[PDB]
Write a protein that binds this ligand. Structure first.
Ligand SMILES: *[C@@H]1[C@@H](N)[C@H](CS(=O)(=O)O)[C@@H](O)[C@H](O)[C@H]1O
Ligand SMILES: *[C@@H]1[C@@H](N)[C@H](CS(=O)(=O)O)[C@@H](O)[C@H](O)[C@H]1O
Ligand SMILES: [K+]
Ligand SMILES: [K+]
Lengths: 672, 671
């Protein structure tokens, strides 16, 4: 009943952990398949066209099981007797089910495991998912990439993104895939691989996990509660630090265009009472105009012409309690000194001809710093220590990580088809080690959009990457909510988004209303930060008018008022890996409706948030689970059920539990 | 000569007349078998088809045995394993024939690799509307609505998908066929009616996927493309000669009743237009939907909408004007034919045992079950009684592509196999009604759907519904590869709606497009117009004097050329050499001609390069090495790329000086 039971039946066998039956094999219903495929992968500016051609897929119907020193060895073939094509070790290790896999045949480069399932089972995770929190009913390729603009082939924006740039994407695309899912049966499954995989949840009777290698091993672990499960899952993958205290001082203002403009906007905003934690100037190292809009010069050193006197102003701003954040990514532009330095030292990834591999990022080309080369890794970390940390940055956006082409040649001589998905975590580790080795862990925060297994430790803060500046479900304001939920279930519990979104293309322009609604949601997350977007002049900004400025100021005061509670949530995330933004089922397991909600979240245990994610709304339907709730703005009391509440601009549908030990604090929001 | 099977060290090679076709080694196996679980969703003739392949087994090991003059080949996954596929390879007629037998009932997926070269081109697979040379892509073969737009990059396609799930893609067609022709001068035919997918993406082999183990395949070589198409029509069959009356000029598409027919006829005759007949698709009744002006699907003269038609038909015949109607293989629920069929049990059923009702778009119809011989004879009698005896000289025989995969048929064969068979069965109904009435060569019907065997049963193809636009994938141009592809697999009579059909998603037919389309139509077996789905949104042939005069002129071009066109139609009947021919069919040595699909040879002696783009005054044309004469100017040209003026009324058309018809073609200078 406890631990790993392998029951041998006449048909075949069953593997169970703590009585939860996970793996079921019979001759008639086999659980494992192996085969061969020849894939075509075309990259274009971070977008991947991936087609497989499967030449063989073989059902391993016949199993021989041997009981051994606590462990089981199972040999599998296509025919009764038959040569062994796959060999399993099934064991309990550190209280988990562990299944190790060993193949004989070098031709085998395709693997499929079926895990038993029910009609009603729901599945969550697979990294940051932007369209579907509950993944049941679809299949999810797991390949880090540009997530897509629009992400739904039915919309005009997606269509145009495909037509013009091959960039529309689809429901499964993400910067942060992960071969790890959580089941409503209260276990998680992890496949240890960095190869392409595709988790297929279309079949009622089983989930099928495809991998483009035979994975070294899988881990399963069960739990009694979702709270316990996520604690165990962060036990495996790791836990994020507490955010620096200064984050709680208010909004990180996204401002570009030089020192003078930053100073003037900081003063204008402070005067209107906005609470500011810091200013984030992504163009500190230099701007770069393309047809896409205002981008950046990818050379990670202060640009004295564009940002005069930044060295002095940073310290000046610090003495007024205003921190400074910059920008870096793992690539270096050909025009810059860092590219030149790297090339001379041999720190860049190579092509088959033995020269620098140059990647198209969109009207400019850059080298890839080869993080498989430990010397190059140390070099890039010194670049961070010297040009960012010592220069007095309190943080930065650590962008990208998803653009490794499958035809690069790396120092470690491992195939790029296997290194591609590993890159985000390697990129994270670089940031983590630079910060840690400088003794700034807990004081400097960087934020990343890309990920893979293990950023649970190495990434100090996620953001949702580039959303469209619109109200679409698949790439607008709403898409952030499943993004936070999904990422929390697999152990990344600190999440935020660009206030206003980023991507202005194909006729999408950011409206005033959208910016305000986005600030409303942002105040009920770990960090409020704004972004000018790709085309600042085409998007409404926070200083676009007095009403907007005052709206953001008000929401900044909401966040700061809640700071003590949010801190407690961030400390719980650090201690037990319980995410800041939680799915409703995590606290209402017995409520069937909560397993399919993805546009509401619990902000800690005691607050329910249901952001207005549609245009031109004055009221909003909310589902409340059975508890005693208080609408934060009105003080009106509600028990469980669907309710409509008024939600004018500035008054997001947010509720707190009357039983909260924080009720005194939440009551202060009536008067703001 | 004939079939040599060489046994090599690691496998075998099968050759026919020295063309090596099949190559099997343990390392490079040619046959794979497996299991799949498919999902097929139908919506108004559009099919979403996804496969889930659970097994695919490489049959690496072959044991070859002699016999009669046949060779028996047993194939397995392991050396001396259980035999999973068994072949008989033999010469029959003068063809390579490969018969296949499986043991295991679980096997429902089959893949044959046939050896290929880097530079090989492949043609056919039925009527292909986007790609004549299919090399470099894969082609599902499942009869369906062909798509509106047919290219995901265009606005029209995008909207067709968003609103109606109807955009389709490059491979969609009403007339797929599991038959291709290789530039190595052989054709390959897979005898199946199951879903198939011919994959030409690999340099070293073509892969033919079938969702069953096919009974057999046939290969045949030839020395020339002319001989190849003769042999291929030798297998599948040959079309009759068209009726003499077709060559009297344009078949006018007119709707809206007897009086409107008379008024249009008078206006057009007075402007000197040569008219062969009138085609009134609403003779049995109209039906308005949100789609536009459609039809009431009950195949009997509608006395209210077409008063006195019985008398006018004979009157028009005395003025040398024939009459054409419309039928399809479905019956509308509101009509008497539906009621009759239901009572007699002639309709296809659902799993609950009742009439299967198919959504055709805002209306529902029953499917006449041609697997029921009694129902077949019944529908043929309906044609004899209501159409032939009523005095129709022809008709559009529409549709054939909408058999749902969950229908239940009298013969109790799975609809996944009967779906692709339906077009040919539908054709056979038309053929037998006409043949049994002794009217073959006097009555002509035209169809858009097809499968293996309409080479005999379909008297005339048309390209179906094109968009009323200039797009390559669904506009005027799309017709040309459609005719070429169809000719290579033995359907040598092809035409299109003059003006196209589909007005949707902002597409409206312009004057210019109608004129350019008439220009191409004059250099095809039949000139016929169509009002389109929304007649008031499309420019018509009587839209203005310039247009009427343009069509009159083009009608005179066609009639002047009638003797030549007749000869072409006679050659198609005798030897199966198609009326519209790829340039490589007469210039085998010219490498550029194997990739041209927007030009054709109209018989041996005329090259046509239709202007298929808007607002053009001139057009670049590729001419192979010969002595050519621009039809309109008399200017002479030898081989190469050349630009010629092509104002409206003056399509880029050339004839060979050497032609025994040069006297006739000279008359076009003055017309
Ligand atoms: C990454 C990147 N798209 C932007 C920088 S740029 O230099 O590539 O333009 C950032 O502004 C985005 O926020 C981030 O997603
Ligand atoms: C078939 C069909 N689409 C039309 C008739 S209707 O009643 O379905 O509208 C014909 O007008 C079309 O030419 C033919 O493709
Ligand atoms: K995006
Ligand atoms: K079409």
């Amino acid at each position: 009943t406890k631990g790993v039971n392998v029951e041998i039946l006449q048909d075949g066998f069953e593997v169970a952990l703590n009585g939860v039956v996970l793996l079921q094999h019979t001759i008639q219903k086999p659980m494992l398949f192996v085969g061969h495929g020849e894939e075509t992968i075309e990259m274009y500016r971070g977008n991947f066209d991936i087609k497989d051609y499967v030449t063989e897929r073989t059902a391993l119907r016949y199993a021989n099981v041997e009981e051994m020193e606590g462990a089981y060895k199972i040999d599998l073939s296509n025919l009764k007797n038959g040569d062994t094509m796959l060999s399993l070790i099934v064991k309990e290790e550190e209280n988990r089910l562990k299944v190790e896999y060993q193949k004989n045949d070098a031709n085998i480069n395709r693997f499929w495991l079926r895990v038993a399932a029910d009609k009603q089972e729901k599945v969550y995770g697979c990294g940051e998912q932007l369209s579907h929190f509950n993944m049941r009913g679809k299949n999810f390729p797991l390949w880090t990439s540009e997530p897509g603009v629009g992400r739904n082939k039915q919309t005009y924006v997606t269509w145009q993104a495909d037509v013009v740039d091959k960039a529309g994407g689809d429901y499964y695309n993400t910067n942060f895939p992960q071969p790890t899912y959580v089941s409503s049966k209260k276990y998680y499954c992890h496949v240890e691989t960095t190869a392409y995989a595709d988790f297929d949840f279309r079949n009622e009777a089983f989930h099928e996990l495809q991998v483009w290698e035979v994975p070294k091993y899988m881990l399963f672990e069960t739990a009694d509660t979702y709270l316990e499960l996520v604690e165990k899952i962060t036990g495996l993958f790791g836990r994020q630090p507490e955010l620096p205290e200064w984050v709680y001082n208010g909004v990180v203002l996204g401002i570009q265009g030089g020192t003078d403009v930053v100073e003037q906007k900081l003063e204008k905003v402070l005067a209107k009472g906005m609470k500011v934690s810091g200013v984030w100037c992504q163009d500190w190292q230099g701007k770069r105009i393309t047809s896409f809009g205002k981008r950046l010069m990818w050379n990670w050193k202060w640009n004295e012409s564009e940002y005069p006197e930044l060295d002095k102003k940073i310290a000046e701003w610090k003495e007024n309690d205003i921190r400074f954040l910059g920008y870096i990514n793992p690539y270096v532009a050909i025009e810059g000194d860092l590219y030149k330095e790297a090339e001379d030292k041999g720190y860049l990834a190579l092509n088959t001809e033995g020269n620098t591999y140059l990647v198209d990022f969109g009207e400019f080309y850059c080298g890839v710093v080869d993080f498989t080369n430990e010397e190059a890794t140390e070099w890039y970390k010194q670049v961070i220590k010297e040009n960012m940390i010592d220069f007095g940055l309190d943080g930065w956006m650590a962008d990208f990580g998803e653009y490794l082409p499958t035809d690069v040649v790396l120092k470690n001589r491992i195939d790029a088809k296997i290194m591609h998905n590993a890159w985000p975590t390697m990129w994270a580790k670089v940031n983590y080690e630079a910060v840690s080795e400088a003794g700034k862990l807990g004081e400097i925060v960087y934020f990343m959009r890309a990920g893979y297994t293990g950023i649970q430790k190495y990434c100090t803060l996620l953001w949702g990457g580039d959303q469209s500046v619109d109200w679409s479900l698949d790439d607008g304001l709403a898409s952030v909510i499943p993004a936070a939920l999904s990422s929390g279930m697999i152990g990344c519990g600190l999440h935020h988004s660009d206030i206003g979104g980023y991507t202005s293309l194909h006729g999408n322009k950011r409206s005033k209303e959208l910016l305000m609604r986005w600030a409303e949601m942002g105040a009920f997350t770990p960090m409020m930060r704004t972004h000018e977007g790709n085309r600042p002049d085409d998007c409404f900004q926070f200083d676009g008018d007095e009403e907007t400025l005052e709206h953001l100021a008000r929401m900044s005061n909401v966040y700061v008022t809640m700071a003590p509670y949010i801190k407690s949530l961030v400390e719980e995330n650090a201690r037990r890996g319980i995410p800041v933004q939680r799915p409703l089922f995590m606290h209402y397991e017995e409520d069937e409706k909560t397993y399919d909600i993805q546009y509401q979240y619990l902000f800690g245990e005691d607050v329910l948030v249901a952001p207005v994610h549609q245009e031109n709304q004055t009221e909003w339907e909310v589902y409340l689970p059975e508890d005693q709730w208080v609408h934060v703005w009105s003080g009106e009391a509600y028990t469980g059920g669907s309710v409509t509440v008024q939600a004018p601009l500035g008054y997001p549908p947010v509720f707190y539990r009357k039983k909260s030990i924080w009720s005194e604090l939440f009551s202060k929001l009536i008067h703001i």
